[PDB]
Each structure stands twice: as structure tokens, then as C-alpha cells.
Amino acid sequence: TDKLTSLRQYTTVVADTGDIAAMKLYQPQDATTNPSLILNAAQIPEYRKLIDDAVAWAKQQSNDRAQQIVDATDKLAVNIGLEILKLVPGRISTQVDARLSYDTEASIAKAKRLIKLYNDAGISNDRILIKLASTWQGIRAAEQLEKEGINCNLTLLFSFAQARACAEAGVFLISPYVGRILDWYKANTDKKEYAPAEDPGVVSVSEIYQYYKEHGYETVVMGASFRNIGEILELAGCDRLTIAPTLLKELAESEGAIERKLSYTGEVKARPARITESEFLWQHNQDPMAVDKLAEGIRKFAIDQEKLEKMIGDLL
Amino acid sequence: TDKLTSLRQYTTVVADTGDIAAMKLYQPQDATTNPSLILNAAQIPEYRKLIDDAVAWAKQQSNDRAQQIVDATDKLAVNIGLEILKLVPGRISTQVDARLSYDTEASIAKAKRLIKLYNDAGISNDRILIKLASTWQGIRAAEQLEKEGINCNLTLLFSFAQARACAEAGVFLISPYVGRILDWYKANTDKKEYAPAEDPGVVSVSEIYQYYKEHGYETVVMGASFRNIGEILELAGCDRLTIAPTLLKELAESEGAIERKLSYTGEVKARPARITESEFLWQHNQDPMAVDKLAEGIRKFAIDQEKLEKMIGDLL
Ligand SMILES: [Cl-]
Ligand SMILES: [Cl-]
Ligand SMILES: [Cl-]
Ligand SMILES: [Cl-]
């Protein structure tokens, strides 16, 4: 047996890519995309049809250029989601424009708009996760969306404060990063070598997992962003893990059974009072890694969004 | 003539220390303190009377230990402020517990408490600045305090978003940092040498000064936190500058007249709509330096507060 097969006994495998080739190859349950993966998957010549469809559709919905750019970029992300749903039985994650990350109202609106486009294609809400950055504003947006039947993937989750706040908001799923946590520690300490169990991204997810299970929270824990297979194996037992094709390949090519690493066998414990905004802000900003990486991840995703819109604008 | 004397033609000189010796020596207009300067000034044997007075007074106001700790640490800061006001004609800046930095209500309450203690000593509000970190919550706290006749010093000002928000809130004074901005650039780029005019902290304050004057804002601009006299000289013309004794000494010992560097000679311009919380959050987090340093400065001031309270708790 190979390690990818063995992992699937303990963990729901999810493919982190916009490339349908990977869906066929690894047959994941869910898939995740983001603005940069959409931007990358756009250059694939076989996807040119999806870009043209998106641009054409946008011109049929309105006559204003600015609106056509937005409509086309949204429809493109959706169009790619639709191709992926042909090949996976579970969820597709589609990311909202990260420029809205500190705007609750705008994020709710944008989530609803992407859902409308999916619904217009005949896809139900139970096949979709809307990905938002887990700022306070994003978490509050997600809380509201869930009440309206729109399930959310709360991403760029770095601090325990973010983890706690997401759970208390009843979000469908969280995407705690692993690899970008490792990146920080390598950039800000002189320890650049870590055993898998002491990888700080692995430690973060394990602690979050424990807290979620021990309090009986339903939010799906999905580790994301990996630098190596060691990190992935150390989180075997995590509800889901979203993994890039390069690392799915490495697992598939690695022989041997693996053991479950993440479990909670105790009973559910009473929950505390909800963390307030002020408490969340204090506790998030206690974590210098999380401070840096949440803001940084948002900046980079917004740049990817802008580049996507540039590409679409040239075709109109 | 010396450079300290020459600077005073263009800029109001302020002493950044809790040490009364410096007030006598340099005869500044205002003084600034903070938890660490209070903690430092506590070890000075000649201040032991101020610590004992604070502890004694606290035991007379109440019988609860926890409240005595808070009362004593507040009274100590106030007691030091009072000794300084004997030797300066202008303002004393006293910093609120930085653990409150993301809590508007608590910060307002704390500001009012420190003002009460000063008022109880016979000091008017026009001699005092309450120093709060310029988070959104701190700015909103300051807006309200100003309306109630309590003047504020908005500190740890790093991003343009913080500057704009403070001006629009009508705060009495801002303390844009200079040296800590330089710190970040040195640590996060491979340029560790900067000409005074290209020092990123100097550039920051100069841009803020321009924006404030050009829009006729009354908020006092007071550069703070300096690594060298080059930075200070490059901001000659800034409304005020708060300077550590070490650097005041260097200026006093430096011979020669200096030129004014910071001026605005144009007419006042129309102001934009107020920045919203969401816009502020977006724009502040676009500035990786400011993201890091605002949170870091708050963490360190809170640690200094805790150490001060430890020291006070041992004496009760
Ligand atoms: Cl968002
Ligand atoms: Cl929208
Ligand atoms: Cl950001
Ligand atoms: Cl952030």
C-alpha cells in the first residue's frame, strides 16, 4: 500500500489546485481553489474555453465595462469550479476577492453573488464552500452566511484567537495554514530545522483540533498549505487535509502504511463564554506570527485578484 | 550656538524620560513617560518616596488587594507626573495600561480614572495628555475623551491610515514613531544604512506633517523614538519632538545653527470623507511595517505594565 491510500483511512483527502488533471488522477473528495490557482489554471490552453465563456456571459449580463470585468472574473472562478465538480463528489472552495477581507457587509454580498452564479448553473449550496480570510470581519460575515444556508471556508487561520472565534461563529470549515507558519519561524528564528512533530504549523493545527473536538464543535478542521509530506503525515486523523498535486504525488509514490496521529477520545467539555471582539483582537495580536501572516496573506491574494482582473480586462 | 538651542526656534522640545534631573537640565516644554520609563525611574533611590506615597495612598482608598495594586500603580505614574509638572511649564504624558489597547470602553474608563487622580492632586486637564496606542479602538476612545475635555497623545503611530484616522477624530496630539520604523526596515531589508532624508521614519513623519497642515488639522505632530540626532535634525520644524536625554545631550553638545526642514507654506485644502473602520483596516494592513510594529509595541508596553504591577504587589 501507498501513503496516500493509507491517509484516506483517517482523513478526507482534498486537492488544492484548479487543475482538473489532478482531480482525475487523485480522485479527491473535495477541491480547493484560490485567486492565484485560478490565475495559474487560466494559462492552461485547455481552459481557454472557460475564460471565453466567462467573458461572453459577462457581456450578456450587462453593458458596463467595470461590471463586465467583475462578472467575468467571478464567472471564470465559478466556471472552473463547475468543471471540478464534474470530477469530485464533494465541495468546491471558491475564494472571495481578498480586498473585501475587512468589510463584513461587502463580503456577505460577494459570497451571495458567487452562490447566485453557482445556483444559476444548477449547483446547490451543499456543493460549495465560500472561502473568506478569517479576520473578525470575515468571521462575522461567515456567521451570517451560515444562517442563510451558505457554507464557508475560513482561511488564513493562524492564531488560536482566530480558531476560537471561528468555532464560536459556527462556520462550516476552517483552513488552518501549516506551511506558512513554518515559513515565519524559519524567517524569524535561527532554527530552520524541525522534526515533523515540532513543526510549529503542525503544533498549531493539533492544538486547534484538540480544542475543537474536546468542546464538540462541528466546524470541519482542514489543514492547508504544506511544505513537505512530513507535515501531512503528522496530521493524519485531521478531518480533512487539502494538499497540492506535487505532494499528493509524493504520498502516492511513498510505500508503507501510516498511523493515525490526531485523535480525541475523551468526552465533550462545557464551552466558555464567547470571545468578544476586544478579547479576540488582544489575543490575535499576542501572536506575532499570526499578526504578520494574516495581513500578508490578504495582501498577496488581493494582488492575485488584481492580476486576474487585468487579464480579463484585456479580453473585453 | 548649539543645535538644541537652534532646534527650539523651529520645534517645541519635549523630554522623553521620567527622570526629573533631565527636566532641570534641558528645561523642556513638555515631558513624556511610559510604563518602562516609570519602571526605570522607580529604581532611582530618590523616587522611593513616590512609590511609598503611592502604596500608602492606595491602602487608604480601599482594602481590597487587587484594587490596591491598580490604585498604587496608577498613583505612582501620577506622582511622577506631578514631580515633573513642578519643573516643566507644559504637558505631562501618562500612558494607559496597554492591555486595554483594543478595548474602547475600558480605555475611556482608564483615561478618566488617571485624570481623576490628577484632578484630585489639583492639576487641570490642560496640563495632561493621556497616552493611548492608536489602534482603531484607541482612536475611537480618544475621539470621545477629547469631547469630554480630556486631551490625548495617540502613540505607536506607524501607518498613514493611523495618521488619517487620528486627525479625523480631532485628537490633541499624535506620536508618530521614527526609530522603530527604521528598526523594521533594517530588519526586513538588506539596506541597513540610510541618509537622514531617506530614513523611512523621517519620511513617514514628513508625509504625515504635510497631510495634516495641508488640510488644516489642529492635531499636534510630535515625532518620537529616535535612534540618532540625524533623524531629529531632519524633522526640524515638526510641531514638537520628544527626545531621550542621551540625544538631548548630543544636541546640546553639538555646535552650529541648523535649518528648518519641515514646513507647509500653501493654503489649507478641502478634506475628504472620513475614513471608515473597514477602509482603515484595509489601509493599515497594507503596511507590513505598521502591522508588525503597532502590535509589537502594544505587547511590550503591556509586559512593562505587568512588571510595574509585580513590583507594586511585592510592597503591599
Ligand atoms: Cl472576505
Ligand atoms: Cl458583490
Ligand atoms: Cl492585509
Ligand atoms: Cl489582519
- How does DSSP assign B194-235, residue by residue? --GGG-HHHHHHHHHHHHHHHTT--PEEEEB--S-HHHHHTT
Distance (angstroms) between ligand 3 centre and the Cα of A77 equals: 22
Cell numbers describing residue A215: 468542546
Identity at B112, one-letter amino acid code: K
Taking the C-alpha atoms of residue B202 and residue B224, their distance in angstroms, rounded to an integer, is 10
Which residue of chain A comes nearest to B282, CA vs CA? Answer: A102
Q: How far is B259 from chain A (nearest CA, A)?
A: 39
Among B161, B182, B172, which residue's Cα sits nearest to residue B291? Answer: B161
Three-state secondary structure readout of A117-186 = HHHHCCCCHHHEEEEEECCHHHHHHHHHHHHCCCCEEEEEECCHHHHHHHHHCCCCEEEEECHHHHHHHH
Data resolution in angstroms: 1.8
Is A54 within 8 Å of A70 (Cβ atoms)?
A: no
Whether A298 sits inside 8 A of B285 (CB atoms) is yes
Nearest-angstrom CA–CA distance, A105 and B279: 13
What's the CA gap between A211 and A205, in Å, rounded? 10
CA atoms within 13 A on the CB side of A58: 27
Q: Which ligand is nearest to the CA of A107?
A: 1
CA distance A42 to A27: 22
Quote the CATH superfamily of domain B1-316. Answer: Aldolase class I (3.20.20.70)
**Residues of chain A with C-beta less than 8 angstroms from the C-beta of B188:** none
Neighbours of B84 (CB within 10 A): 26
SS3 content of chain A, % helix, strand, coil (to 5): 55, 15, 30
Inter-chain residue contact B295 with A288, CB threshold 8 Å:
yes
Q: How far is the CA of A109 from the centre of ligand 2 (A)?
A: 5
Cβ-based contacts of A293 with chain B (< 8 Å): none
Strand pairing partners for B157? B176
Q: Which residues of B25-56 are buried (b: 16+ CB within 10 A; e: fewer)?
A: ebebebbbbbbbbbbbbbeeeebeebbeebbe
Separation in Å, CA A124 to CA A90, A118, A127: 11, 7, 6
* SS3 state at A17: coil
Determine the straight-line distance between the first and last CA of chain A, rounded to whole angstroms: 50
Spatial separation of the C-alpha atoms in residues B228 and A188, rounded to whole Å: 26
Put simply, whether B288 touches A (Cβ < 8 Å) is yes
Q: Is A66 exposed, middle or buried (0-12, 13-18, 19+ CB in 10 A)?
A: exposed
Q: Taking CB atoms and an 8 Å cutoff, what residues of chain B touch A282?
A: 99, 101-103
Pairwise CA distance, residues A135 & A298, whole Å: 10
Q: What spacing in Å lies between the alpha carbon of A150 and ligand 2's midpoint?
A: 15
A178 by Cβ neighbours in 10 Å (0-12 / 13-18 / 19+) ranks as: buried
Task: Quote the CA–CA distance of A290 and A277 in Å, as a whole number.
Answer: 16
DSSP A102: T
Distance A73 CA to ligand 1 centre (A): 16
Residue B150 phi, psi dihedral angles, 5° rounding? -110, 115
State CA A264 to chain mean position distance: 24
Decide if B131 is catalytic: yes
Place of cell 484595509: B282
Report in angstroms the alpha-carbon separations of B12 from A267, B17, B34, B243: 64, 16, 20, 11
The amino acid at residue B109 is A
Determine contact: B187 vs chain A, CB below 8 A.
no
Dist. CA B219–CA A107, nearest whole Å: 34
Nearest chain B Cα distance for residue A152, angstroms: 21
Cα dihedral across residues A299, A305, A311, A314: positive or negative:
negative
Burial (CB count <10 Å: 0-12, 13-18, 19+), residue B113: middle
> CA A23, A28, A29 angle in degrees (round to 5)?
125
Alpha carbon distance B292, A279 (integer Å): 19
Residues 6+ apart with CB under 8 A from A215: A167, A268, A269, A270, A271
Enumerate the β-bridge partners of residue B242: B14
Distance, first Cα to last Cα, chain B: 50
Looking at the annotation, which residues of A are catalytic? 131
Cβ-Cβ contacts under 8 Å for B49 (sequence gap 6 or more) = none
| Inter-chain touch B295–A281, beta carbons under 8 Å | no
Nearest to A9 by CA among A236, A304, A192: A236
CA–CA dist B244, A305 (Å, integer): 46
Residue ranges with strand state E in A200-278: 220-223, 240-243
Instruction: Please name the residue of chain B whose CA is at the shortest distance from the CA of residue A299.
Output: B286
Quote the CA–CA distance of A197 and A186 in Å, as a whole number: 16
Q: Which residues of A touch B137 (CB under 8 A)?
A: 278, 281
Name the catalytic one among B3, B75, B110, B131: B131
Q: Say which ligand is closest to the CA of A100.
A: 1
C-alpha to C-alpha distance for B274 and B166, rounded to whole angstroms: 11
Neighbours of B274 (CB within 10 A): 12
Does the CB of A102 have a partner CB in chain B at under 8 Å?
Answer: yes
Find the B32 Cα to ligand 4 centroid distance in Å: 30
- B298, B133 in Cβ contact below 8 A? yes
What's the gap between Cα B4 and its chain centre? 20
Phi (first) and psi of residue A240, to 5 degrees? -140, 160
Given a contact cutoff of 8 angstroms between Cβ atoms, the answer to whether A204 and A176 are in contact is yes
Q: Which of B189, B280, B291 to mutate to test the interface with A (most CBs of A within 10 A)?
A: B291
CB contact under 8 A, A288 and B299: yes
- CB nearest B291 (choices: A135, A278, A291): A291
Residues of B in contact with A288 (CB under 8 A): 292, 295-296, 299
